[PDB]
Structures are given as structure tokens and as C-alpha cells.
């Protein structure tokens, strides 16, 4: 049961963990025994926000908004956007202005955007600081969390904090 529907997109460079973040949230598990599959594209989950029951739809959109009319309008009705980079890979951080442009250009003026730095579990291999990403987020009025799709650290919060701001 639910009283509202929130559409989410999840975007960012290939291999940053978009499919894993979506899977960890909807199914509460990290695979590790299934490296041979493509990686989950879509999912849903009912959450409780501010005393309300809300259904979240989540789409690893993969740039299909340029080709598919239905993907085009889902994008235009997006309530939230997770913009994801890989903390161990600076190039994924460097492409954020491009992803932010797409996001804003192709959604609607209400769309709430959250920045996620994924793979926080790989501490020894950190390539991007918390501090620089926090300043990018603050400049652009985004929410910001460092998270780990593998361990589940801050993954629930990622989706829930966005939803509470959507009100």
C-alpha cells in the first residue's frame, strides 16, 4: 500500500556501481556470486517518509532518453536523481558537470538531485577526497553522501534523504 509514487533516475559513468546501488536498496543484498550478468536496470520499493507510504521507482537509465520516447518522458517526470561517481576513479568525478547538465536539461524544475560517491569500502584506493566533492555539492545545491553498495553503508540514507527533501 502507498499514497504516492516517486520516479528516480540513476546516472553516471560506466562501472561506478549504479546497478549495485539499485540492487542493494530494493533487494537488501550485494551479489558477489553473479558477476556474469549484465546488471539490474530497473526496480521498485515502498518506503515510509514523514508518516507517508511512498512507492519508489528506480531506473538505471543508461542514456536511453536520447532514443526511447517512454524513457524520454520518465526522465521529464523524475522526482529525484542520484548522480554517481567512483571514489577510486577520478575520471568519473571529472565528468560530473556533464552528468549535471544532462540531469537539469532533461528533467523538470522540481527534480531533487543527490551526489553519491560510491565504493567507500575501498579505503586504501581512494582517489577523490570527501572535501572536494562536498564543495562541488554545496556549490550546486546538491545533497551529498559517500556510500558503499557492497557493504550497504549509507545506501538506505541515500534514497531516503532524497525522498524527505522531495517532501
Ligand X SMILES: Nc1nc2c(ncn2[C@@H]2O[C@H](COP(=O)(O)OP(=O)(O)O)[C@@H](O)[C@H]2O)c(=O)[nH]1
Q: Smallest distance, Å, CB 18 to Mg ion?
A: 5
Burial readout 135-149 (b: 16 or more C-beta within 10 A, e: otherwise): ebbeeeebbbbbbbb
Identified binder of Mg ion from the candidate list 12, 13, 17, 19, rule CB under 5 A: 19
CA distances from 122 to 6, 19, 32, 110, 141 (A): 31, 18, 15, 34, 27
The residue (of 7 and 119) whose beta carbon lies closer to ligand X is: 119
Chain residues 86-145 in contact with ligand X, contact rule CB under 6 A: 118-119, 121-122
C-alpha 15 chain-centroid distance: 13
Q: Judged by CB under 5 A, which stretch of 55-63, 82-90, 116-124, 137-145 contacts Mg ion?
A: 55-63
At residue 42, φ and ψ (nearest 5 deg) are -140, 155
Residues numbered 51 to 80 that lie near ligand X (CB under 6 A) are 60
Task: Decide if residue 85 touches ligand X (CB under 6 A).
Answer: no
Asked if residue 20 belongs to a known ligand binding site, the reply is yes
Residue 148 binds ligand X (CB under 6 A) = yes
Instruction: State which residue, 83 or 142, has the beta carbon closest to ligand X.
Output: 83
Task: Extract the C-alpha cell encoding 109.
Answer: 524544475
Nearest residue (beta carbon) to ligand X: 17
Write the DSSP symbol of residue 114.
E
Asked if 60 is part of the footprint of Mg ion (rule: CB under 5 A), the reply reads yes
Q: Please tell me the distance from the alpha carbon of residue 28 to that of residue 156, in angstroms, as a whole number.
A: 9
For the bound state, the minimum distance from the C-beta of residue 144 to Mg ion, rounded and expressed in Å, comes to: 22
User: Which residues line the annotated binding site for Mg(2+)?
Assistant: 19, 37, 60
Amino acid at each position: 500500500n502507498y499514497s504516492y509514487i516517486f520516479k528516480y533516475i540513476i546516472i553516471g559513468d560506466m562501472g561506478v556501481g549504479k546497478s549495485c546501488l539499485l540492487h542493494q536498496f530494493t533487494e537488501k543484498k550485494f551479489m558477489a556470486d553473479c558477476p556474469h550478468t549484465i546488471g539490474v536496470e530497473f526496480g521498485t520499493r515502498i518506503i515510509e517518509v514523514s508518516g507517508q507510504k511512498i512507492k519508489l521507482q528506480i531506473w538505471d537509465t543508461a542514456g536511453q532518453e536520447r532514443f526511447r520516447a517512454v524513457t524520454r518522458s520518465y526522465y521529464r517526470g523524475a522526482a529525484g536523481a542520484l548522480m554517481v561517481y567512483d571514489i577510486t576513479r577520478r575520471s568519473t568525478y571529472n565528468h560530473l558537470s556533464s552528468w549535471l547538465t544532462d540531469a537539469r536539461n532533461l528533467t523538470n524544475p522540481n527534480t531533487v538531485i543527490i551526489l553519491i560517491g560510491n565504493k567507500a569500502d575501498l579505503e586504501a584506493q581512494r582517489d577523490v577526497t570527501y572535501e572536494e566533492a562536498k564543495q562541488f555539492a554545496e556549490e550546486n545545491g546538491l545533497l551529498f553522501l559517500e556510500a558503499s553498495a557492497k557493504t550497504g553503508e549509507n545506501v538506505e540514507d541515500a534514497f531516503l534523504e532524497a525522498a524527505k527533501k522531495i517532501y
